[PDB]
């Protein structure tokens, strides 16, 4: 019984093919955690946000690759918090398939700090935590090189940051961590 | 050549309603974010909003909540901004730039339209 | 709201000299994961619309003469013209593209001497 959303980070900095491999590592993800009582949602940020599938409209069509090939980037810059409080507010919402007593789990998958964004992480994560949200951070390449920056991605996941923060070097290395993740979500299902 | 093309001078009647029109001639509006910036008599820039024509998606200063409405046209690859219950504070240059999607998180304003004259007088 | 503070509002500037304009912003515009300062600057010439002139704030635009250079980060950035010719009498706009709302500054209006 779990309710697997996806919030990925749709700004300009991501190239076209890497915005691509990014959709690869999605579905390969819903295909390996392909279960009776298991529903997807995925929602694209950046300045702008964008559901591109509902729990309600996975559960009608649950084919993963049917789902993410049509989605497109948004670009522009990054409103990760922003993103945040609407995953929780309306991919979490029982009008949009959500279920009442199912594993709210979160998967974040972003190239960049968040940056001029009207919301703060202090007004997005509490909300996330009450909600009972198990947040997931995967962090690509350079931009989380730094003490500061590594901080931002604990931020996002919840606690431990060992069991829910992810970090590779680019996009083509996603494939590296899909087992990881995969027996991540396993664990405590 | 690659350039902004705005529509013609607008003299309208307080209260009235005004839509001004923007026509990239070289590149597509999908491929743009299309600003709207008004310029009062001998006064500065001030930006209105934006709109992101591939999804309609639209942000605007709080200063301009009800006053302006940024829409565009992919067809027409036309781009618009409706001023409503204009007043002599609308009277002003605007101007439509373009900030475009060249592989970073944002960008700056590269284009710009040659300017709208709107005069707001009963 | 990023107020964007221009010096000085008006500048007496004379054929061949080198002018300097100060742009100071009241938030940080520096990303740190890109490293590039949000911060633009724009010409504009009488009875003409604002043309970019200098972006990233040390980027120069296509066809820009070597003469304007954009220095600074951060917070406090300045606009350089080495060697000023009579085609630069215009009004220098800085403008932030950090955050929303796009916020410009109050320009900076070149006038010749005498």
């Known amino acids: 019984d779990s309710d697997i959303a996806f919030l990925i980070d749709g700004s300009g900095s991501i190239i076209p093919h890497d915005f691509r491999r990014m959709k690869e590592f999605v579905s390969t993800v819903m295909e390996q955690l392909k279960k009776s009582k298991t529903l997807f949602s995925l929602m694209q940020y950046s300045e702008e946000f964008r559901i591109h599938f509902t729990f309600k409209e996975f559960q009608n069509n649950p084919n993963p690759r049917s789902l993410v090939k049509p989605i497109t980037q948004l670009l522009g810059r990054t409103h990760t918090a922003t993103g945040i409080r609407k995953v929780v507010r309306e991919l979490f919402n029982i009008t949009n398939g959500a279920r009442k007593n199912a594993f709210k789990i979160l998967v974040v998958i972003t190239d960049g700090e968040k940056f001029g964004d009207p919301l703060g992480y202090e007004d997005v994560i509490p909300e996330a935590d009450r909600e009972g949200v198990i947040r997931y951070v995967i962090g690509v390449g350079d931009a989380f090189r730094s003490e500061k920056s590594r901080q931002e991605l604990n931020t996002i996941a919840s606690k431990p940051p060992r069991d829910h923060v992810f970090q590779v070097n680019n996009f083509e290395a996603l494939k590296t961590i899909q087992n990881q993740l995969r027996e991540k979500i396993f664990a405590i299902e | 050549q690659v350039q902004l093309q705005q529509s013609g001078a607008e003299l309208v009647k307080p209260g009235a309603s005004v839509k001004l029109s923007c026509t990239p001639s070289?590149?597509?509006?999908?491929?743009?974010?299309m600003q709207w910036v008004k310029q009062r008599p001998e006064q500065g820039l001030e930006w209105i909003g934006r709109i992101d024509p591939a999804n309609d998606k639209t942000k605007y200063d709080p200063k301009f909540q009800g006053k302006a409405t940024i829409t565009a046209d992919t067809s027409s690859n036309t781009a618009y901004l409706q001023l409503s219950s204009l007043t002599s504070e609308d009277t002003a240059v605007y101007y439509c730039?373009?900030?475009?999607?060249?592989?970073?998180?944002?960008?700056?304003?590269?284009?710009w339209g040659q300017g709208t004259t709107v005069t707001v007088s009963s | 709201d990023i107020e964007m503070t221009q010096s000085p509002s008006s500048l007496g500037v004379s054929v061949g000299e080198k002018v300097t304009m100060s742009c100071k912003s009241s938030?940080?515009?520096?990303?740190?994961?890109?490293?590039?300062?949000?911060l633009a600057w724009y010409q504009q010439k009488p009875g003409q619309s604002p043309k970019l002139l200098i972006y990233?704030?040390?980027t120069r635009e296509s066809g820009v003469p070597d003469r304007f250079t954009g220095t600074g980060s951060g917070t406090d950035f300045t606009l350089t013209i080495s060697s000023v010719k009579a085609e630069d009498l215009a009004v220098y706009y800085c403008?932030?593209?950090?955050?929303?709302?796009?916020?410009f500054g109050a320009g900076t209006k070149l006038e010749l001497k005498r």
């Open positions: 938030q940080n515009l520096l990303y740190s994961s890109n490293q590039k300062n949000y």
């Open positions: 730039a373009s900030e475009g999607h060249y592989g970073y998180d944002g960008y700056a304003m590269d284009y």
């Open positions: 990233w704030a040390s």
């Open positions: 070289g590149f597509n509006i999908k491929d743009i974010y």
């Open positions: 403008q932030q593209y950090y955050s929303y709302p796009l916020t």
